[PDB]
Amino acid sequence: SNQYQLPLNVRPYTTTWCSQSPSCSNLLAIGHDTGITIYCASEEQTPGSTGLTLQELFTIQTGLPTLHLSFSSSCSYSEPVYSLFLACVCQDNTVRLIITKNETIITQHVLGGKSGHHNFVNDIDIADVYSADNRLAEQVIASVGDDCTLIIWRLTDEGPILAGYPLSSPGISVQFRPSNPNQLIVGERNGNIRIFDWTLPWLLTLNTLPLVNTCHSSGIASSLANVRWIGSDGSGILAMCKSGAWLRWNLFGPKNLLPNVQGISLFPSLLGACPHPRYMDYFATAHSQHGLIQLINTYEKDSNSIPIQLGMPIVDFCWHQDGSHLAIATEGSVLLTRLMGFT
Amino acid sequence: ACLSRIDANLLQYYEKPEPNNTVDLYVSGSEYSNCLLLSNSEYICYHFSSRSTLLTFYPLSDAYHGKTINIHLPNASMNQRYTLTIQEVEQQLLVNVILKDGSFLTLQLPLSFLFSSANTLNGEWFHLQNPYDFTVRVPHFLFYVSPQFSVVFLEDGGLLGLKKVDGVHYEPLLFNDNSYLKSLTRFFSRSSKSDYDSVISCKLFHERYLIVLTQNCHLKIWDLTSFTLIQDYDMVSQSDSDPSHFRKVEAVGEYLSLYNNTLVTLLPLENGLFQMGTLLVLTYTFQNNIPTNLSASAIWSIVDLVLTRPLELNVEASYLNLIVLWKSGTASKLQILNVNDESFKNYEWIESVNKSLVDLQSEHDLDIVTKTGDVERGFCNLKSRYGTQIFERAQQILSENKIIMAHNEDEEYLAN
Numbered sequence: 001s002n003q004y005q006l007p008l009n010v011r012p013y014t015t016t017w018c019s020q021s022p023s024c025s026n027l028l029a030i031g032h033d034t035g036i037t038i039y040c041a042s043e044e045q046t047p048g049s050t051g052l053t054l055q056e057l058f059t060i061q062t063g064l065p066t067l068h069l070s071f072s073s074s075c076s077y078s079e080p081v082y083s084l085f086l087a088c089v090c091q092d093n094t095v096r097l098i099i100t101k102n103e104t105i106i107t108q109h110v111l112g113g114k115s116g117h118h119n120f121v122n123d124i125d126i127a128d129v130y131s132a133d134n135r136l137a138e139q140v141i142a143s144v145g146d147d148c149t150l151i152i153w154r155l156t157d158e159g160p161i162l163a164g165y166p167l168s169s170p171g172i173s174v175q176f177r178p179s180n181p182n183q184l185i186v187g188e189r190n191g192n193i194r195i196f197d198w199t200l201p202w203l204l205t206l207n208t209l210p211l212v213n214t215c216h217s218s219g220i221a222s223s224l225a226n227v228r229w230i231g232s233d234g235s236g237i238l239a240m241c242k243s244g245a246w247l248r249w250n251l252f253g254p255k256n257l258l259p260n261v262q263g264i265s266l267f268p269s270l271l272g273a274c275p276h277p278r279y280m281d282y283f284a285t286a287h288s289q290h291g292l293i294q295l296i297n298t299y300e301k302d303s304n305s306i307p308i309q310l311g312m313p314i315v316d317f318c319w320h321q322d323g324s325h326l327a328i329a330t331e332g333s334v335l336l337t338r339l340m341g342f343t
Numbered sequence: 344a345c346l347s348r349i350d351a352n353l354l355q356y357y358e359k360p361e362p363n364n365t366v367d368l369y370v371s372g373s374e375y376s377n378c379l380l381l382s383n384s385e386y387i388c389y390h391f392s393s394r395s396t397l398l399t400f401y402p403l404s405d406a407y408h409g410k411t412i413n414i415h416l417p418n419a420s421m422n423q424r425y426t427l428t429i430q431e432v433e434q435q436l437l438v439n440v441i442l443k444d445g446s447f448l449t450l451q452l453p454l455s456f457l458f459s460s461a462n463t464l465n466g467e468w469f470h471l472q473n474p475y476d477f478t479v480r481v482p483h484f485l486f487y488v489s490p491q492f493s494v495v496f497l498e499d500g501g502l503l504g505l506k507k508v509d510g511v512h513y514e515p516l517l518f519n520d521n522s523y524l525k526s527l528t529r530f531f532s533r534s535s536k537s538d539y540d541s542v543i544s545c546k547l548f549h550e551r552y553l554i555v556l557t558q559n560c561h562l563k564i565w566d567l568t569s570f571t572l573i574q575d576y577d578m579v580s581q582s583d584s585d586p587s588h589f590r591k592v593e594a595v596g597e598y599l600s601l602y603n604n605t606l607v608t609l610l611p612l613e614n615g616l617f618q619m620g621t622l623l624v625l626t627y628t629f630q631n632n633i634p635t636n637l638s639a640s641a642i643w644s645i646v647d648l649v650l651t652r653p654l655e656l657n658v659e660a661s662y663l664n665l666i667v668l669w670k671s672g673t674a675s676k677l678q679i680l681n682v683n684d685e686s687f688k689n690y691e692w693i694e695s696v697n698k699s700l701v702d703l704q705s706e707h708d709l710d711i712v713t714k715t716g717d718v719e720r721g722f723c724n725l726k727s728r729y730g731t732q733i734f735e736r737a738q739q740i741l742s743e744n745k746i747i748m749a750h751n752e753d754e755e756y757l758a759n
Contacts, residue, residue, distance in 0.1 A: 220724025223716020242716030
């Protein structure tokens with residue numbers, strides 16, 4: 001493990017790799033109480049133990065807390081100059097898209113007030129949509145909140161298009177489908193899981209609550225932590241409960257009648273699962289409060305693998321695109337740790 | 344299923360799983376429980392403990408703030424609650440209990456005291472007494488008839504009378520019994536541990552007639568004016584006389600209850616026969632045998648039955664209603680037999696749901712509302728759902744069995 005300190009007065013809230021855009025996949029953003037900081041990951045000589053070190057590049061000042069953070073495919077590099085596009089959520093309950101050239105915010109769009117969410121925003125994600133001619137036609141941001149609303153915010157050539165959709169319960173996560181921006185997934189706090197075609201009722205709703213194996217009772221309150229697609233065509237869906245209970249469904253052949261596989265993490269997962277970018281069957285989950293991280297294999301290859309235990313709480317974490325490195329933001333730092341097995 | 348189950352834990356709203364006002368009286372409840380209505384329109388509940396050493400009283404409509412009274416007994420009653428009676432005489436709960444050693448204990452609990460704040464009781468609230476020698480001929484069933492009179496039933500088959508002269512003392516008024524003379528036959532002995540045809544159920548009719556059901560399902564009828572056996576019906580020789588097996592009832596239970604002049608009796612043939620005739624003058628006259636609808640082998644036991652005036656059911660064609668409570672382990676079954684007409688030949692069985700909605704939803708994972716997520720969230724969820732009495736009893740059973748919460752997020756614990 002190598003450890004890289006965040007500035008002394010910087011409290012991290014969120015950590016994400018720029019896996020969404022290959023030109024910028026070595027860019028790391030930390031949303032904190034005064035903005036979003038960008039770091040670069042480089043192969044040093046090091047020892048080929050952790051043959052990867054972190055270089056802090058710069059800090060984008062915003063003046064208020066950043067709670068969720070997503071890079072877009074529009075990110076680019078030039079010589080040098082970084083052209084960034086970031087979706088995030090701020091203390092004023094607004095959802096924003098910030099477009100920068102390095103630390104300087106050259107452009108900013110803000111969706112808030114009554115036109116925005118009418119309660120706390122719980123999650124956000126972003127994807128670039130191109131026309132048939134293949135110019136940038138739209139950038140699309142999806143967000144979910146405690147106002148029982150899902151918001152699709154499309155920024156198009158002739159300007160913004162806003163749409164709201166009602167939910168049976170607070171939205172706790174949202175993510176567009178890989179290799180198919182026409183589809184996306186929305187998570188409700190109550191265990192409902194929506195598959196949605198925004199170009200169009202919405203196509204499908206699964207639910208983890210009634211499926212709990214109950215060989216070991218998952219408890220009275222098993223609030224849904226997370227749902228994410230897996231695979232590079234978005235061939236699968238993985239859902240994780242706060243309790244640690246997880247379930248996986250695949251989407252291809254024949255007729256289907258239950259979720260394909262199911263299990264339970266050793267610990268609660270407040271932050272939910274972070275699926276491996278290269279190995280579908282694998283995902284990571286943290287015991288954020290004691291600072292341990294379990295690695296789970298869906299086809300039970302795993303047998304309780306806990307590669308990571310810190311002596312401190314974990315605020316957030318995410319896989320580097322290479323699949324062997326992990327970046328983890330803790331309350332005062334970010335660690336890059338390399339698991340030798342995944343190399 | 345026309346009825347549903349609503350479960351009530353009278354302490355559910357409060358944190359303390361026990362009333363602050365509990366008083367323990369001492370004489371020099373998970374085996375029986377019942378309710379009794381009093382002069383003041385209030386229901387008093389009572390419980391006789393597993394050992395039959397503790398009697399507990401508490402007010403149905405004020406369990407938390409009202410007083411629960413634990414009366415401790417020097418020893419257990421001869422034969423559980425079956426050797427115990429409780430009736431409201433005059434502004435008092437009169438409780439009599441034949442104890443194991445033979446003593447006949449009287450309790451007098453003033454109505455006031457049951458609904459007072461007091462933790463003390465004045466005057467003679469209990470009397471010990473030895474009216475008969477129960478060492479030789481052991482009794483097993485005590486039946487209240489009147490404030491001064493009530494009969495005792497014996498294991499060997501004999502009846503004893505018990506007449507109150509003053510206010511306290513009791514004396515044996517014996518009944519004529521020539522049933523014993525069947526000993527003369529090669530098929531019965533006085534000395535035999537079998538052969539007893541003891542009473543297993545008993546009801547008082549029109550203050551004077553005492554209707555008894557025996558282990559061989561004979562309905563004998565005693566006139567208390569005469570103190571003489573007036574009737575003796577063999578209940579079983581009416582329906583299909585099965586030579587294979589009629590289960591002579593091997594314990595005291597609730598095998599009959601009467602309303603006006605009607606009388607249902609529970610006879611065991613695969614545990615499934617409700618005979619019901621009519622009483623009239625004294626004469627008992629058969630009408631019909633109504634079987635039961637029970638399967639999975641028929642392994643339900645009668646808990647209690649109550650014949651009574653008809654209900655408001657989905658069938659207007661009704662004359663009488665029998666409420667029936669079966670049990671099989673800790674699972675229960677409530678049914679209502681509706682008899683349509685004064686002939687007991689047209690009837691219909693009405694079932695009910697024997698689990699509450701909350702329980703069914705929890706079992707069948709049909710609960711969409713309860714918040715999910717945190718391990719402590721599940722804690723609040725279960726705590727709030729179950730109530731403190733149960734939740735703490737469960738946490739008691741956990742630590743006894745050495746199951747201890749590892750950390751904040753021990754999901755393996757919550758499961759348990």
